[PDB]
Amino acid sequence: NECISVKGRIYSILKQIGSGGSSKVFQVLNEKKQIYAIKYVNLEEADNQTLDSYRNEIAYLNKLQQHSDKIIRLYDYEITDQYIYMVMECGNIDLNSWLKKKKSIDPWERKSYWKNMLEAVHTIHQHGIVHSDLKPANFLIVDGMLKLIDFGIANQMQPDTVGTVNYMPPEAIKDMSKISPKSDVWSLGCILYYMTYGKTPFQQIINQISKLHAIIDPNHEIEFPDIPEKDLQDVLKCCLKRDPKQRISIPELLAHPYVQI
Template structure:
C-alpha cells in the first residue's frame, strides 16, 4: 500500500493547513432557511472549528475498516467486495476523483457542513457537504436544483461560482436535470451525499454589517453614504442577474452575499425557484425564507387575497427582502427586529395597515429608496432596473447655472423690453449686450490680450451704462 502525503505547495511558507484559524468566516448557508444567521437580530453563524486532522505526520497509513475485515471473512475467496479508499477521509475530501485537503470547518447546520479546503494546485475553495439520507425528497431535490442554477449562472461575476460537484445519488440528480421527481413525498433512504466545490469568500455581508455598526456605535457616527452606495449597487446587480435569468432567490439576506476578492457575490440557491416562461410568479408548496426578510406574500403563499386571487411569490418578494437588507444597512437592524417571536413578526408583516418606522436620515432620497422597496402592495414596489437608476444611486444633475455674463445680458434684455417705446434706451441696452456676449466684436472681454484693451472695454461699458441711467431717469420723470 503506497503512503499518502498531505497536499503541499512549493514556494509558499508554512503549512497551509494552519490557515484554518480564520477569524471572519464567510457564510455558505447549509440548512434551516427560516432561521436567521449572521443578522443584527442576535442570531449568529456557527463558529469556525480547528482542522479535523489530528495526525502531525505528513504520512498516512490506511488500515482496513471493520466492514472490510468482515467481508474478507465471509467471502469464500477472502477478497473484499468493497474497494478500499486510497486516502484518509479525516484529512481529505474526494470530489470527482480530485482530492481537497481539509483546512477547517467554516459552518454547519442540520446535516450539512461547509469546509475550507485546498486543492492540489494550491487554490483555496469552500466545500459544501450535504448528507441526503433521511431528508425528504423535496429538500434533496432543492439542493440538487441549486447545482442546476449555479451551472446556468456560470461566468456571471456577481454570482458565486461552482467549481465542481458530485452527487452520489445519481438517480436524484437525473430527476432534477429532467425536471421531474418520482418520489416527491418520500424520504431518501440511501446513504448519499452532495459535494459542491465553490469559490472561497473572505467575509459575508452579515459579518461586515456587524463590524461596521460596532465601529459606528463606538464612535457615535452614522453610516457613510458612499459606502452604502458602493455595496447597495453590487447587491442590486447580483439580484438583477438572477432575475434576468427568471430565477427568484426567495432567501435574500446579508448572510447570502459573500465578499470574494473585494466584490459581493450572491450565494445559496437552495430554495430558489425558476419562473415559468408564461408567468411572472412562482408557486410554492410551503412558506420559505428567513423571517425578518420574508415578504408579506411569502407568509401568505397560496392563500387568497381580498379579490379572491391566489397569492403567489415572484420578483417583488426579492425586492422586499432587499428593502429589509437596505434598512439594516442604514439603521443596523431589520425593520421588524423589535418583534421577537414568529407570530409577532407574522402579524405585523402581513398587516397592510402596519407602518414601518423610519429613523431620520440626512438624504431624503435614501428614505424614498427604502419605501420604494418596502411597499406592502407588491405591485407598488420598484423593480431592479428602476432601483439601479433611483436618485440615491444616480443623483439628478442640477440645471447649469448661468454665468454672470449671461445674467447681465438677461437683465439688459428685460430693461430693453421695458423701454421698448424709447429708441435711445433700447439702443443703449443693445450696445451693452453686444459688448458682453457678441463673439465677433473685437472688444469681447475674452479676446483682450492687453491691459489697454481691457481698460478701453470697461470705459466703453461705463459710458453706455451712464447714458442708459440718464435715459431711464428722464423716462421716470416724464
C-alpha cells in the same frame, strides 16, 4: 489532518464554516495552497424532493456562472447517489456576520454592496428564479464585492466558528400564488434598512407572532428617520411598500438616482 477528494483533486480541510441538516461547508486548500469552499451533502437519508432541490440548485449555479460575477463561482462538482461535493470560491465573510460586528458603515461601501445585490438578484430573476428567502447570510464578501451564495432552491445552512422572519415579505404571510420578483425587493429593502439604521424594520418587536402582524398591518407605519442621503431614504420607502404591485421593481431600482448618481 482531514482531506476531501473531488474529481481526482485532493483538498485539505482548514475548518467547518457551516452545517445544515445533511449538508456541511468547509474552508479548504488545494495542493498549491489556494483557498476554496467545499459544500458536502450526505444523500444516504434524502427524499426525492430534497434530492431534486440540490440537483436544481447545482444546475442553476452552473448556468448562471457566465451571466454575472456577482454569483458565487462553482469551479467543479461531484454528484453520486450517496453524496454531493461542490468546489466553490471562498469568501472573507458573509454579510450577516459582517453586519453583526456593528462598527461604522461607509456610505460608499453600502452603495457599492447594494449595487452588487441588485445585479445578483436581477440575474436570477432574468432566468425565472425568485429567491423568496433572501437574508444577509445569502450574500458573501469577496474581493470587496458582494456575491449571492444560493438561489433559495436548496435547504438553508447555519454558521460555525435558528433563522429570521424579519426579511419575510407581507405577501408570503397573507398567502397560505402571490410570490413574484417583488417578494425579493422587500427582502433586499430589509437588508438595506439594516445597513442604514443598524437594525431591520421590525427588529424592535422581539416577539415573533406580534412581528408577523406588524408586517401585514397597514396602520403599523415603518419609521424612516431623516439621513443626509435623501435618495437612500426613497429606495427604502419604495422597497418596503406592503402592496407588491405598488412596490418598486428591480429594473426601476437599477435606474434609481441612489445607484446612478
